[PDB]
Design a protein around this ligand. Structure first.
Ligand SMILES: Cc1ncc(C[n+]2csc(CCO)c2C)c(N)n1
Length: 389
């Protein structure tokens, strides 16, 4: 099991970033001296902009380069990201840092499609699940390591960032010896039309994309919300346990999603709408309680419900589509998700735009998930009217 074990070791090491938990307290700390206005209005949105603009060329280069060099591109981008996060001041350098984080994250689809051209067709699902679990274990291990090192050990965030850079460098070293994958546009667009030219073919797609949008745009500013509620100047912040338990219970929910004896056509959209309304309630609670432990708990509830929703949505999408287009659909829906996220980010987040405060944009995010709650309910009620006949 050497080729799969090496790949899962690479996933474990690349995903083992103990500093994503403890990021905003470092960025706004004495190490870089960046004000919350500056960070949350110009630094962070560049990640979304870069991820959007680079998802398309990454997707093209992945198939153009036979899926191998994109993994090393991800490793090198992570290495330079974690070096510049050790040594960069000002604003432009950190903006390019988030650009490099974007080019790193845009290649996750490439990393997960690398498996399809090196393994057997029958075992592809099981090895993909194994690698996803490897990434989850890596992130949980990094999260608990950072929490243990910053809570009782009293280790500064600079050394923790050094650990993050060491782990991503080890990931690059592992990736360098990965076995090579030895194994129209109008028509593809016409086939893309056929990807939604049916009753269930269109379904779950835009809701997967829009829920992914909400998740992506709330996870990173949730760090800022925790910083605002509990400042890091003279208080100990327990992020690592929370980013550990969130991923752990998300994996648990992913496992439990397949054990529910429920058919899609019966109440799938109704259950998704209920889950989305619960997500909106959790976001509003996290924004408005003013207590830190309960807002971490509501964040964990968000994580669990989002993982359940994504698992059911991607199960339905995979049932709708063929195995040869898994990467294509998972790329197109992520592309439109980042497009809508960037649109809303220029509307409410970007300093050149309206630049609304972080405590205010979460009121939109709660209403934003309340907005998808209504349309999913309305589309769910649309099937109910058809179910009447
Ligand atoms: C270096 C770096 N780390 C994380 C993010 C954004 N981000 C992605 S996932 C997640 C949750 C983990 O706490 C966060 C904050 C970034 N833009 N740059």
């Amino acid at each position: 099991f050497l080729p799969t074990a090496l790949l899962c070791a690479y996933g474990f090491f690349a995903s083992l970033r103990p500093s994503e938990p403890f990021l905003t307290p470092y960025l706004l700390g004495p190490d870089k001296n960046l004000t919350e206005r500056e960070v949350f209005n110009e630094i962070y949105p560049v990640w979304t902009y870069s991820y959007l603009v680079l998802l398309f060329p990454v997707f093209l280069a992945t198939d153009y380069l036979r899926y191998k060099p994109v993994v090393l591109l991800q490793g090198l981008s992570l290495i330079v990201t974690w070096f510049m996060l050790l040594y960069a001041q000002g604003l432009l350098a950190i903006q390019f840092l988030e650009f490099f984080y974007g080019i790193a994250t845009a290649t996750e689809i490439a990393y997960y499609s690398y498996i399809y051209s090196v393994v057997d067709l029958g075992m592809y699902q099981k090895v993909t699940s194994y690698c996803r679990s490897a990434t989850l274990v890596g992130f949980t291990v990094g999260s608990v390591l950072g929490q243990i090192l910053v809570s009782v050990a009293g280790w500064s965030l600079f050394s923790l960032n050094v650990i993050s850079l060491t782990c991503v460098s080890v990931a690059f070293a592992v990736a360098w010896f990965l076995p090579m994958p030895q194994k129209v546009l109008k028509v593809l667009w016409n086939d893309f039309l056929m990807c939604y030219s049916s009753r269930p073919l269109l379904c779950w797609s835009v809701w997967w994309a829009l829920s992914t949008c909400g998740y992506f745009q709330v996870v990173n500013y949730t760090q800022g919300l925790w910083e605002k509620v509990m400042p890091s100047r003279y208080a100990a912040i327990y992020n690592g346990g929370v980013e550990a338990v969130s991923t752990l219970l998300g994996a648990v929910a992913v496992f439990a999603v397949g054990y529910i004896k429920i058919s899609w056509s019966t109440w799938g959209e109704m259950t998704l709408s209920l889950f989305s309304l619960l997500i909106a309630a959790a976001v509003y609670i996290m924004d408005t309680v003013g207590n830190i432990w309960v807002c971490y708990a509501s964040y964990v509830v968000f994580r669990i419900i989002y993982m359940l929703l994504i698992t059911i949505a991607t199960f339905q999408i995979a049932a709708n589509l063929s195995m040869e287009r898994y990467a294509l659909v998972f790329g197109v829906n992520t592309f439109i998700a980042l497009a809508l996220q960037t649109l809303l980010t220029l509307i409410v987040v970007d300093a050149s735009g309206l630049g609304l405060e972080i405590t205010t944009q979460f009121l939109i995010y709660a209403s934003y998930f309340a907005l998808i709650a209504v349309v999913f309910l309305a589309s769910g009620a649309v099937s109910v009217m058809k179910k009447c006949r």
